Amino acid sequence: KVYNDGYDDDNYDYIVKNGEKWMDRYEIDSLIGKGSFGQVVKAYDRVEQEWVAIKIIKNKKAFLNQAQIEVRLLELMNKHDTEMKYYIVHLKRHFMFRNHLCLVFEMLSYNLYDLLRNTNFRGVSLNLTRKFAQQMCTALLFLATPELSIIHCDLKPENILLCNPKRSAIKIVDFGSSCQLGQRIYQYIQSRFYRSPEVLLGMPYDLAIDMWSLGCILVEMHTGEPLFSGANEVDQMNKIVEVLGIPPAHILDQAPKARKFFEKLPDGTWNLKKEYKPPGTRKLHNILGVETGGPGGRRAGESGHTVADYLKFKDLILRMLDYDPKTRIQPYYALQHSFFKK
Numbered sequence: 001k002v003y004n005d006g007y008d009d010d011n012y013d014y015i016v017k018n019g020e021k022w023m024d025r026y027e028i029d030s031l032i033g034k035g036s037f038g039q040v041v042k043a044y045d046r047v048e049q050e051w052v053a054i055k056i057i058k059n060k061k062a063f064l065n066q067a068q069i070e071v072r073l074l075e076l077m078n079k080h081d082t083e084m085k086y087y088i089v090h091l092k093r094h095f096m097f098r099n100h101l102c103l104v105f106e107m108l109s110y111n112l113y114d115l116l117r118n119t120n121f122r123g124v125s126l127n128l129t130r131k132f133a134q135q136m137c138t139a140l141l142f143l144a145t146p147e148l149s150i151i152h153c154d155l156k157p158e159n160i161l162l163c164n165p166k167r168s169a170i171k172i173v174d175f176g177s178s179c180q181l182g183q184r185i186y187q188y189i190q191s192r193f194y195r196s197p198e199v200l201l202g203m204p205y206d207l208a209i210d211m212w213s214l215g216c217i218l219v220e221m222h223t224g225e226p227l228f229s230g231a232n233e234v235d236q237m238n239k240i241v242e243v244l245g246i247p248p249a250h251i252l253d254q255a256p257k258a259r260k261f262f263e264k265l266p267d268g269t270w271n272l273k274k275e276y277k278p279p280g281t282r283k284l285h286n287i288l289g290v291e292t293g294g295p296g297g298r299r300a301g302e303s304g305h306t307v308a309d310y311l312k313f314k315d316l317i318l319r320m321l322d323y324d325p326k327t328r329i330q331p332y333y334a335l336q337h338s339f340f341k342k
């Protein structure tokens, strides 16, 4: 009947009203996004004389506390990037309003999945993919600084926003599922398509999980389609194996969940448990179209898509997709890679 004295709906969300004034400061314009956490509204900040995005968290304890974690991490980050040069969304301030935690951010545009839809799921150019890659690796370098040691834990196209729909600048959003290296708590993390092998295998994890996700994202940005589109964990592992082969024995031998996906043979080697291409036969070389005109052959006869360019990109991606989190490429070295040698 009544939710939050009439201010909320039956989904724990604030009922947005165009033109409402809050706290003698914000005039709410319109709803511009929503998700599991709540809503995002465009509002005018009359004190600072600028448009802002306000993320209005659901009035529900689990969502509140998720956002409190997010606020703490954003405050830590923003504090160490006062010039806003490391591609993390800027939290301006926060407040509690009518039993909703509200996070005030800079305005941004839509996400990189919306950009892919805008390409009719045919992909962005290799040059634009490179610009996204360079910004993302720079962000991951900042998150790896020791005072931060932040693992985002949910990198996907939907959590990377354009600043402006006609430009390449991005910001990473949604630190609600994030953690710090000193303070890992979650066993179940990462959205499935972008989930690292160490997490699938129930093994220890660190900031390298975010690099795995980035490798997956960058291929998808150029092809238009997810690299590893599993329907469930077993399918996800099998799709990874089609491209990358059986994981190293030294890893599977230490993996609590190895036998969810694999079986250990009499000779000590590992094979898949019993519909899929044989291990390692779905070549990234062919998914990218390195020698055959890029994805779908559609980049044949276009500049900015040579065999040489594609071989650089393939090499970087394979380093991001190293099964071993100890040897998987780290942000500093990703930035030095020949793919970014203009």
Ligand SMILES: O=C(O)c1nc2ccc(I)cc2c2[nH]c3c(Cl)cccc3c12
Residues within 6 Å of the ligand: 032, 033, 034, 035, 040, 053, 055, 089, 105, 106, 107, 108, 109, 173, 174, 175
């Ligand atoms: O702050 C975010 O996690 C955030 N998440 C969103 C989820 C779905 C949609 I649709 C939009 C989201 C979103 N949009 C944002 C804008 Cl426009 C500025 C600053 C942060 C965000 C943000």
